[PDB]
Every structure is written in C-alpha cells, then in structure tokens.
Design a protein around this ligand. Structure first.
Ligand code: GLU
Ligand code: GLU
Lengths: 251, 251
C-alpha cells in the first residue's frame, strides 16, 4: 500500500510549518488542528501519507471563462492528491465535482473589522462605498457572494468585483493585515475570526453569521476513502476528540 | 414623567431574582445581562422604570385558532408595558405587530443534547422517531419550525406538533432537565446553549446554527422610544460595553 498524497494549505491554526532547532522531516514538518486530524485518520483507517501544499496556493473556485476549477478542488479532480485535509468548506458547487466526508467542524461567514466603530452589520457596509471590504480570492466566501441572490450580498459582490484586484486577497492573513492598516472590513469564516480576535484586542466580529456550513475532508469523486473517513470523523466527534482538538489549537 | 413599565421574563443569565441575606426592593430585586442593559438605557435616555414579569410566562406567539398573540409581545400590543427588555428574538412575524430596536446580541437556533452519542445534526434527529425532541412552547424557535418550508424542518415540526404536550416545554430550564433525564434533544438558541454547556460538562451543541437572528428591545408599534433605544444600544455596542456585559454574565 503506497502512501497517500494529502493536499492542504497554510492557514493558522489548522496547518502551519512546525518550528524547531533540529532539522524536521516528513510529516513532522507540519502541525495544527488538521495535521492532528490527519494523523488520527491514518491510524484509525490504516494508511501512511505525505503532506503536499496546494501548488497554486488556492482553496478552489470555478473560472468564469473556461469553467475550470483551481486550488485543492482541482488537484483532487485531476487525481494529484488522494485527500484534501484542510479548512475546506463543503459547498453545493464543489460537491458537483469532488466528494466530501461529513463535517468535522461547523461555521459561518461573518465580518472582521476594528472595534469602536459604528459598523454593526453587513447592511452597514453595503450602504456605503467609503469603507472597502473583500474576501479571499478563489475561496468559498467569495463564491458565496458571487452567487448570492440576496439584494444586500448581491450589491456587495458588485462592489467587490468592480475593485477585485484592490479588495480580494490571497489569504486570510493578508485580509487581517488589510483590516489593521486601512479602512477595510474583511468577510471571513467565523472559526478563523474567533482565533484572530482572541489574539488581537483591536479586532472584533461584526454582526452574526451570514450563512451556515461545515469543513470536510475532500476526496476525488468516487473515492473509496470518503465513506471510510466519515466513519473515522464521526467516531472522533462522538468520543470528544474533535472538541479536545479545537480547544488545543484555539485555546 | 411617570416611570416606564418594563416587561421581561425569567431566563438565566439575562434575568434572574437577586439573592441577598437582607430584603431587596424595587429594581434591585433583579439582576442579569438584560437587567444591566436596562439600567444603562435608563441613564443614557433619562427615564425611571419598574420591572414586571410577563404574567402568562410566555415570550410570544400567535394562536392557531383566533390569531391573537400572547406573552411579552401581547403585553406590548395591549400597552401593559412600555418596553420589553429580555432575550426577545427579532422576527418577521413579530415585526408585524410590535417594533424592535436594532439587535443587542446575535445568535441562531441550534441543538442541545448529551455528548457521546452518534447524533451529529438536525438530520440525524429528523431521520428517526425514537429520540424525542422539542422546543419552548410559544417562542421564536417553535414558530420557526411551524413556519419552515425546508423539508427537514417541516418533518421535525410534524413530529413536535403530533406530540406537542409531551415534547414542547414551558421554559429553557425545563428543556435542559428533559435532556439530562431522558432520551431527548432540545432545540434552543445558541447563546443560551453556550451558557448551559459551560456549566454542564455532560452536554453539548449538536451541529451548527439552523438560522441567524438577533435579540432586541421590543416596544408597542409606533413608540417614540424605539429609535432612542436603538441609538443607546449602538453606543453601548461601539464602546464595547455590550461585549463586557456578555463576558460578565457568561464567563
Ligand atoms: N475556507 C474557505 C476559504 C476561505 C474563505 O473563503 O473565507 C474555502 O474552503 O474556500
Ligand atoms: N428567545 C425566544 C424564546 C426561546 C426559544 O424560542 O428558543 C423568543 O424570543 O421567543
């Protein structure tokens, strides 16, 4: 049984490079919530693996022109990876091209901004054009706005799209920095906002959740590993290990 | 200027009877997040007040037979109170009969159950008839299910409705006890689940948020106080006082 190739993406505290004085090798080079999850999956299901960072640095979205996918989603479609273990949102459009396990974490889209301001909701941001706002390019949040039919979200996308290169960023980290250095509000996932606000007393979530979704392990469509992984995840959930993992990495 | 009559309801940690070795009088007889909020409103807007407990002990729903409202909603409609300061959900159906200030807290409907079970979502509950589940009678959660057109929620309401007397309860506290003593799952608001799971290590939230809403101060339709209260709440939110109040009562 050859090792499985697992694609992922850098994103604290799910996946990060492990720091050490002595040279690190193999799977020990990475750490995080998803790295701990992957380890548990491997021993419960009996497989060895190698971690690969998604080459184009993206989560995954479909191209308007050629309709092709990119990111981790595309790597799965082309069989360049056996699994995708990262904070990968389970979405209807993605389910048309790849398979997902049951979710290992639930969350929703929300807003990150500085505290001490009069902005209290997405409506407050959408009714003005002075304060800029955006999201991670080629990710699930950007896609949510791009496909939304809800007036407020639809005009917010018209805004983002018209200033795409200035307001859509390559990573959550870039988005956080943009919030701390300019009149900018960032649309990101609640679980990540929780982590961020706990470490930056000047930041806060604005309003509640704009939607509801979950993170799941991705596999190429038809993979025999998808149902096995769901079994492993449910077991970890039931015994309280996923809760323990969240507490460990979020604190 | 006569003092305002403020209706509310017993619900920890928003409203509870204050304990003391010595006799308590007037507004000092109560305490909680909503009691602190009410005090702040009174000094910012300049009014005196008296706290009243909703007489029929309900939040508010429309009667299936005669369409009449009950609970705090009805006390506002009948002008038995000037304001309703409690964890009162801002809903479309309620907005048709009373007015609400902007939200002072955001939340969503979710599931409370024992940990260590294979139940992981509302779907896991809806696909079986053994484990019973319910909600607070005449509250926003019940109304959400009664009016939902979403298949899963629609079949869950059919279930609750068909066993109404056995599964709907008079209070969140009754629901919590039902969960701790029988094979029962309880549909309640996330902010309350947060408080409960923090004090009962054997309980946990199941799945994510089923919907998104907020709590606001209610007033009789057309009341000149509604816009004034919104101004007060936004001020408290911006200065971080609402955040401080949440941390104080949830810990
Ligand atoms: N977690 C998202 C990326 C970040 C975001 O869209 O907020 C995804 O799976 O695409
Ligand atoms: N907060 C709810 C009551 C509790 C519930 O419905 O879960 C209301 O305002 O009706």
């Amino acid at each position: 049984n050859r090792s499985l190739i697992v694609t992922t993406i850098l994103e604290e505290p799910y996946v990060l490079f492990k720091k050490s004085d002595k040279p690190l090798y193999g799977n020990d080079r990475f750490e995080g919530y998803c790295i701990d999850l992957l380890r548990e999956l491997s021993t419960i299901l009996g497989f060895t693996y190698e971690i690969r960072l998604v080459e184009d640095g993206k989560y995954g979205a479909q191209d308007d022109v050629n309709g092709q996918w990119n990111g981790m989603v595309r790597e799965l479609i082309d069989h360049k990876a056996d699994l995708a273990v990262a904070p990968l949102a389970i979405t209807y459009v993605r389910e048309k091209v790849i398979d997902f396990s049951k979710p290992f974490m639930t969350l929703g889209i929300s807003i990150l901004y500085r505290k001490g301001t009069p902005i209290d909701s997405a409506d407050d941001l959408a009714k003005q054009t002075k304060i800029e706002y955006g999201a991670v390019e080629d990710g699930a949040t950007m896609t949510f706005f791009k496909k939304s039919k809800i007036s407020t979200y639809d005009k917010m996308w018209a805004f983002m799209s018209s200033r795409r290169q200035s307001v859509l960023v390559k990573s959550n980290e870039e988005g956080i920095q943009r919030v701390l250095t300019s009149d900018y509000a960032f649309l990101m996932e609640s679980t990540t906002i929780e982590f961020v606000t706990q470490r930056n007393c000047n930041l806060t979530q604005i309003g509640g959740l704009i939607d509801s979704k979950g993170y799941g392990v991705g596999t190429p469509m038809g993979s025999p590993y998808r149902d096995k992984i769901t079994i492993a995840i449910l077991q970890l959930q039931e015994e309280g290990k996923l809760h323990m993992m969240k507490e460990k990495w979020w604190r």
